[model samples]
Target: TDRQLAEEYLYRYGYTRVAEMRGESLGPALLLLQKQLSLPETGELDSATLKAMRTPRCGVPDLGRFQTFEGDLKWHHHNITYWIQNYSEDLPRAVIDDAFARAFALWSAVTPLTFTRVYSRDADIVIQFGVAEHGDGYPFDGKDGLLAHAFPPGPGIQGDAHFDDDELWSLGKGQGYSLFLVAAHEFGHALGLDHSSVPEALMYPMYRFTEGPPLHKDDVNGIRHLY
Candidate 1:
């Protein structure tokens, strides 16, 4: 059970494509996962590995190469609309709205892309909070796991962001997962960018509670490159 859990962790975060390869050992993926998280590269899943896995992170998979969504994955229009269908129970609607607006501003300030809030109509992106198996095929894994997920720009459900309501979302640094930081990260995906290998980058796979500007230069570069 323990070994399989670690394997799933590796596979979930773009470590291995397919599971259970008898010839292929888990060392390579584990090592890379360790490397990415700044863990000791023992090539074995140990206590630190388990602890990292349990920490809050985005639902999106780790980089399977390609820092940004390739080809036609980006939004066609510079002006995008978003609708928040629900709110997190932990924060007020105004707080949540402000956080999202600020998060959107992070990208807008660097690029020509603009985001506007919409109501009573279909928007380019729909935001919602849900528990496990809330549809769209990606299910939440309760607390201290997947924080949220967003789709790359396209049509239908694409560009939609689903936050796992199981988390204790907050604006304070020490309270819970910072809504602004995670939203900024998820919005990167909603804008067709993928996980950046740079640990300090907003698009990095793992979440970190850091100070200063939320976006790393690499994140700005990626967004500017795509838009």
Candidate 2:
């Protein structure tokens, strides 16, 4: 078999590294990515890797977090209420509200899941803007980079969305890391959808600047399946 070929192809990824010093020494990790995507063990950068890399998905790494490894965390209730614990000065509160409302509508458009901004300690989801070490185990790095993170649905940390206050959050979708774009992705986590392996998917991991509908067909299908 072309074992050498597969090894070289997998190690080319800058992020892929291990104790193995050679470029062709990515066995365990390489196998994992291929298996995670249900691809044949050609061990080479076949269409599978290229296809998945181009897909839009959660920013969460392939590690077990964020359901990147088959995360199914979602809400059990239809009428979901969210509370904003804090805010960013990027836009006025009203403008921020409008922007977030627009993002929320994108998800609700296809599924029975509805979102609301309510004031209550018992709200289903909590929203906030903060700097490094925002009390959550995850911390924001800085402005215009690694913008935000959200927890999959469950109890305490579940269904919570948090953003970095260091950046000039924008109203435009993924406008070089737009707040609305990031929020839409976080909301997907709040709604129990995992990152999609399709580049066009709204649930894709990276922040993509696009004017297309925030919800992709993969998203619509996934949400409908849940509701």
Candidate 3:
């Protein structure tokens, strides 16, 4: 049953194209997922692989071998602005703002892009937390299921990002999900980059607590490619 569930996970996250699987085997897909997660590439769903599969991750699809969105959505300029529509009750205002500031700062450090936090008027990127259905078609799944998601750069909802309020948002090394880490990753999408195959990359589909700048060399390369 778990193996089937694992197979389903693969299809859900773009590990395999189910429409083409009519005459194909799932072994190769299994190996790919295992490789991405750094699990033993046994080409079979084992205990450890299942454990990693259950971990909380981003809502974005891995898209198999690709590293960026197909349309290649990106901002036209380096000067960007973001507005926090609402705050997560789990953390104080100072902590939340600080976390997000650092997240944006990470990207600014890597490229010519500049980010400014705007209080009034519409901004380039709108950040907020919502549970279940907020407004966008993509709704959050209560707790651990889907942590957060963001749209690629564009007008209106394109650069907006929504976080699932059900999860216990935490600061560095604290329990629950790390706001800094997830925010940074979501911003990657908001800036037009897609999920990277590199595990150490901040744009990886899965979530992991990270240190320092949190952007791997691949992440730097991807963002650089955009701006």
Candidate 4:
């Protein structure tokens, strides 16, 4: 039934992972030392012991705040047009419009390139929100499997962005993860930015609950390098 499918779709959305720390489990060994000293009956590690095992990874550096992209980079041609497709009843037209504006602003804050919005269906870039087999090779999973995806920088679909409306989007504190944040990230991809190996970088692939100020040095340099 449609209702059952909708419930199933909503259930599986919005879980993200932070990178794991390597060789950071000295806490367990320390717990063993304490146990040996006191001869405690329980050998299992406690919650506090497990908590101490992980180390905070160094934050990514902050590169110069902004860079302008006047022309196309190596992968794509310059002067690309982008179109926004409103497919989800869950999101209002105004919110959808604002999401694109905010997403574009995130990139414009860095690159000097200007992007004009196209209203026609035949526009080169198409932005939409939906599930698998949406025509592009990259299909959307019903809910949380992939928050969103975008095509790499190029002439045709180069700057398109697609969001999974199945996930909750909010503007308020802790209401849910911001759609703006995720869309900003996707826009980075649209502009030829690849995922960062550095965990602290915004393009690091997985979402972090707390991100440093937008467009860290790693991100700025990465985009400039691509261009």
How does each model score on lDDT? Answer: 0.82, 0.68, 0.82, 0.54
lDDT of 2 by residue, 91-179 (tens): 78887787678888998878887888899757778888888888976666665535677777777777888888776687654443567
Per-residue lDDT of model 1, residues 75-190, tens digit only: 88888999999898899999999999999999999989899999833898898899999977778998877889988888777888888889889974878888888999999999
Error of 4 at 161 (Å): 1.8
Residue pairs with colliding backbones in model 4 are 13-144, 63-217, 67-110, 68-111, 68-112, 69-111, 69-112, 69-113
Runs in model 4 with CA error above 4 Å?
Answer: 1-78, 122-124, 209-212
Per-residue lDDT of model 4, residues 129-207, tens digit only: 7666666665665555456766555455555677766666564246555666677777777777766655566776555
Error of model 3, residue 183, in angstroms: 0.6
Tell me each candidate's TM-score.
0.88, 0.73, 0.86, 0.61
Worst 10 residues of 1 by lDDT: 62-71
* Regions of candidate 2 where Cα sits further than 4 Å from its true position: 1-59, 66-72, 173-176
Query: Between the candidate structures 2 and 3, which one is better when assessed by TM-score?
Result: 3
Which regions of candidate 1 fall more than 4 Å away from where they truly are?
18-23, 35-42, 46-48, 64-71
Best by TM-score: 1
Shift of residue 27 alpha carbon in model 2, Å: 5.8
Name the runs in model 3 displaced over 4 angstroms.
1-4, 18-28, 35-39, 64-72
lDDT of 1: 0.82
Residue 87, model 2: lDDT of: 81
Over 1-227, each residue of candidate 3 has an lDDT whose tens digit, in order, gives: 77777876788777777325544567777777787667788987778878878888898766542233344478888888999999999999999999899999989998889999997537989999999989876677788967998888877777877889999999747588899899999999899888887777898888878667688899999988878
Give me the displacement of residue 179 in model 3, in angstroms: 0.7
